[PDB]
Amino acid sequence: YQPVALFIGLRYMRGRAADRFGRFVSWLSTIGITLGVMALVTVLSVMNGFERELQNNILGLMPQAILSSEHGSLNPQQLPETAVKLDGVNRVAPITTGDVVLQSARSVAVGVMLGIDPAQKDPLTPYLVNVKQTDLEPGKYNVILGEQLASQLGVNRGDQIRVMVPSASQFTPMGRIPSQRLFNVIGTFAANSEVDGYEMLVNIEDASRLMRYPAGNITGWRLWLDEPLKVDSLSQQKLPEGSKWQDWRDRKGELFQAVRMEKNMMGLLLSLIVAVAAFNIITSLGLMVMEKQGEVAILQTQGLTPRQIMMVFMVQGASAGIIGAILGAALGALLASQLNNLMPIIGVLLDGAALPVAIEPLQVIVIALVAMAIALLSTLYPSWRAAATQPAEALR
Amino acid sequence: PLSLLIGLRFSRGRRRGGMVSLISVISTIGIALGVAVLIVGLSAMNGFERELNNRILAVVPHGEIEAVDQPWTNWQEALDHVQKVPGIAAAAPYINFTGLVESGANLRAIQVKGVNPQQEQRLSALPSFVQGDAWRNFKAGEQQIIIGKGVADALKVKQGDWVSIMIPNSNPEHKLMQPKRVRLHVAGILQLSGQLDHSFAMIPLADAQQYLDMGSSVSGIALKMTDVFNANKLVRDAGEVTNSYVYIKSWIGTYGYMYRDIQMIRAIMYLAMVLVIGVACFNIVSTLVMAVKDKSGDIAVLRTLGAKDGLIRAIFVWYGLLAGLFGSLCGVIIGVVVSLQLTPIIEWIEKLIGHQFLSSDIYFIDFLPSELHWLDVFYVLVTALLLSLLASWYPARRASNIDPARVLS
Amino acid sequence: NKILLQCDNLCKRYQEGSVQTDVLHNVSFSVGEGEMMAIVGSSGSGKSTLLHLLGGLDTPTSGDVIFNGQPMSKLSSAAKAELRNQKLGFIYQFHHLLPDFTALENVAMPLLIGKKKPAEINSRALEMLKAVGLDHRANHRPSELSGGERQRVAIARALVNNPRLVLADEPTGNLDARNADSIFQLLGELNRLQGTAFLVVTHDLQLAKRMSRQLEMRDGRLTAELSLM
Amino acid sequence: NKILLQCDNLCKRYQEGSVQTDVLHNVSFSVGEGEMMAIVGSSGSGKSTLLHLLGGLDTPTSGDVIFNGQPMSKLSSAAKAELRNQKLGFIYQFHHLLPDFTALENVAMPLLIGKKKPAEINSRALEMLKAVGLDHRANHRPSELSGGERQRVAIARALVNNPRLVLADEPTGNLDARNADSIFQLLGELNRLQGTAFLVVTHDLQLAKRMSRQLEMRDGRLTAELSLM
């Protein structure tokens, strides 16, 4: 026959059809763990969707990784792109990046300049308006500004702006002179994100000449990742000799770090629910033991080892945990990816887009196993207490 | 007193000590954890509200009106019409520059605000937040500027140091190119918040009009309401009073997300802790089921003395309410203990665990504040009592509907 | 002369199918106020079921307990509650005490359910306490006292409200004679003066002979009804 | 003669000093296989705890119960489990059934504990039902059952796997006589064929005298030792 503990364990949690109430009383623990895991999964899914939106709006439009040389600029001859292949990277493109100061007639701003070759598309080119991508040919100093940046400076097509770099200043008898050049607006870039505020595009050749680099050099290789959330792990990868690694956490790391922190803060703030549910489990057994002590001793008079009775109660506890966790995960998955449908018929707090929802099965699996382990630890103690009790004291 | 004292005796009727008192302390721990964490969260949000009230909305201009075409020829006329508009506490003019501050080979492009000191004292509490300086002696004709501390430390400049300021000063003539580079002397350091101090630099308004070579005019007018939550309509009306050339900007568009996020955080914690108390009241239900199964004989005896069909229900509802009451107090004690020593607790955790919580110019404040509101405590305790009563309600009704003779024979 | 309560043709079956036995048939009582009736019978001879039925604990399958022509069955269970609290006093032969209350609460509990204000109920309890004779140990735990004392405390708490009908199902089985004669005389003056009626069911024949006119309730049938005259 | 079971200086105390009663102290037994020892006495005269000590359920303070050379003290818990599973069968004072388990599985439970395939265990359960005589009531609910049947089902459970030693502490409290004769005939049948030894505790001397060998323990000490042959 199947191991003896399983039969008794499965049979106690069912039965007692004379009232149809004891079933609810015993399943209260499963209900509580189900609500806890449902709340966890739905809130983590919503926050993951919001974070996915942020990463496609902030990181989606900026160099997600940048590989440069140890000293000075990068020479494409030394490290060709076909020789620059790594794990997790799906695309490599030559790039130069810099921080510059932009001077219009009426106001001044700081910006991030991206020197690229016009023949290659960037994820912002679909948002480019009234601008041929190939038009950024070298020597004409064609520059595309963001919509918010252009609005703040208040210039448009056909207006000149002075771009200067103070970090690349050169000493002369008239002091330190920062590099400067006049640039001609050729259109506007409208991506409707924070990046639109400070990102501006120029040709790679003029950009290289601007930072006082020797001709033919580029700053480095921009690398795209399938999952940037693990850049730290990618930072541990072996790199080609003489290179250095840089990444987005230089500028926008803290914010994303903050987001992650906030997540796991809520990650505990709702997790407490299941912890409380765990407590209920113990009390449930605190019921059943005193409701079944006068019977378990008989099983003791049978061949039941104490190590078998510990199992027969722990398996009941684990069965409650398993059923609760699986049912809660199923209800959370059903509620996720569909809350956009149910929300409008009732009051919706947010204005505009209703709600982003991105569900990652890894999170669901992790929280499911966490629920399993917490249920097991909760059900451990009363089982051992019942096992250690000698039959005589239970009887008298 | 009340005839329900019997229940307390059942509360004092605890036998078979050991493994039966464990469930009691488990229930108490659950109630206490839920209630205490709820109170910590609510007090932390109230402290955040207080700090947003003091640190930020008392230094920013609550309303802005800017001329779209030209600096006002009649700025004084517009302002002295608008100061008698009802629902307005004060108004003042200001001029808005943006320029390059350079010192120690470090250059930063920042916006500059030129205001009249005696009026901005009324317009805001900003000079009160200066660490230490001549916040009142700041006047015109001295080539003095005040810089926020973040810009000062990122620029490697200190008090009593000289800086150069470059302004475009565009003119229709050829002088628009090669922006004018004046010299200036820093005088004080501001310490407002994590974000506000990295962009504010203030100059005297008369020296502002002098350094621009512009006329007796300002680039905008700032407004302070008495009530801020309805500033949009008030500023719309105020701009309606003067000419139609104005454009109104209300802080609410920029900063109402902070308020609404605080409200939604409060809602999230409230709902989640309601769920927590719900699970704990399931625990209470289990305890009462055990109590009924163990005192069936005594309740039968109570029945054979001619008690009514609700008296037993009253006994057990009071039993449940008392059981919840014990844990609720045992949690609110900690809840009140924290939220007054909370900041040292959090900095202790911060030193013990080498991880910064809110710093690095993302949250508006650095530390975790707190403020205790007793009405919130009362509301929370009432919520706990109501949930416990709702839980205890069903077992009482079940106990009422058992006939002693039905089971005895 | 019975007017208050009359029992007629009490029938009850309390088993499942197949083994379903109509244990009782044509059970009728003639209990008149002011008269002392005793029920005699042997142990396990089908006497406890109807005796518990006489308290209105379960609904008879057939037969009536009629009050002045007003039937209990048609009126609500709350009516049964005040009948059990104020007009009728019923005693189980088990102790059935409350370990959590002292003697004072254990004896005044029916008065407490009588929702009267503290002074007169407390005085009434003290009066019953002096009549019983256990004033020495008033406020300690009843659990740590002897058997007969607990039984007589149960009897006292049953007789505090001076109910019309006092059904006492062997009050002296676990009691010695030194307290038995005292409680017998006590109930004697209560019966002669206040006039409450007693239906005392007892097993031992000698103590059964101590009552004036005697029924014999055997095997669910009233066979012998012995009267002095 | 006696090989299976040997008791050595049985002593047991389960409380603290001074108040410690020597219910067992230097008590030795001669338990023979194939014979019927019966112990008689009153309630609370050490009839229960003594015989529960025989099952290895508790640890005696002094002395040990040795079965074929294994003292309980050095004997592991699993070995005691197998011993009480395949050699000893015990009946409590009550029925001690499992209200979650129906009669068939309730009586087959040790057989599944015996870890053998369902066919023979179900066949054994059916033949036990034949011997008990309740072919009609095989799968109905113990809750919808009377007392004597459930206690005799408990006895059957205790005897399914053919104990060498069948220990019974007053097995017929709720069981009447016209069933008692039949069940004791069944026990005699198992005695003449299987030869298992029954240790029956009882209060009435009539049934106890018809046992072959009888010890009498009054106030915790064995007074009478009479064996027919």
Author numbering:
A (entry chain C): 2 to 397
B (entry chain E): 4 to 412
C (entry chain F), D (entry chain D): 2 to 230
Reported in the publication:
Lipoproteins in gram-negative bacteria are sorted to the outer membrane (OM) via the localization of lipoproteins (Lol) export pathway. Among them, LolCDE, an IM-embedded ATP-binding cassette (ABC) transporter initiates lipoprotein sorting by selectively extracting OM-destined lipoproteins from the outer leaflet of the IM and transfers them to LolA, a periplasmic chaperone. Here, we report cryo-EM structures of LolCDE in apo, lipoprotein-bound, and AMPPNP-bound states at a resolution of 3.5 to 4.2 Å. Our studies snapshot 3 functional states of LolCDE in a transport cycle, providing deep insights into the mechanisms that underlie LolCDE-mediated lipoprotein sorting in E. coli.
As the initial LolCDE sample contained predominantly apo-LolCDE particles, we reclassified these particles using a soft mask to exclude densities with bound RcsF. After several rounds of 3D classification and calculation, we finally determined the apo-LolCDE structure at a 4.2-Å resolution using 135,391 selected particles. The overall structure of apo-LolCDE resembles a dumbbell. Strikingly, the TM1s and TM2s of both LolC and LolE are bent outwards creating a V-shaped substrate-binding cavity open to the periplasm. Both PLDs are in elevated position about 20 Å above the plane of membrane, as a result of TM1s and TM2s extending into the periplasm. Moreover, the 2 PLDs interact closely with each other, manifesting a twist of approximately 20° perpendicular to the membrane plane. In our apo-LolCDE structure, the Cα-Cα distance between Ala106 in PLDLolC and Ser173 in PLDLolE is only 5.4 Å, whereas the distance is increased to 48.6 Å in apo-LolCDE*. Taken together, we conclude that our apo-LolCDE structure represents the correct apo conformational state of LolCDE, which resembles closely the conformation of RcsF-LolCDE. First, apo-LolCDE embedded in the inner membrane adopts an outward-facing conformation. The open conformation of apo-LolCDE allows lipoprotein entry into the substrate cavity via the LoopLolC-TM2LolE interface (i.e., the Interface I) in an ATP-independent manner.
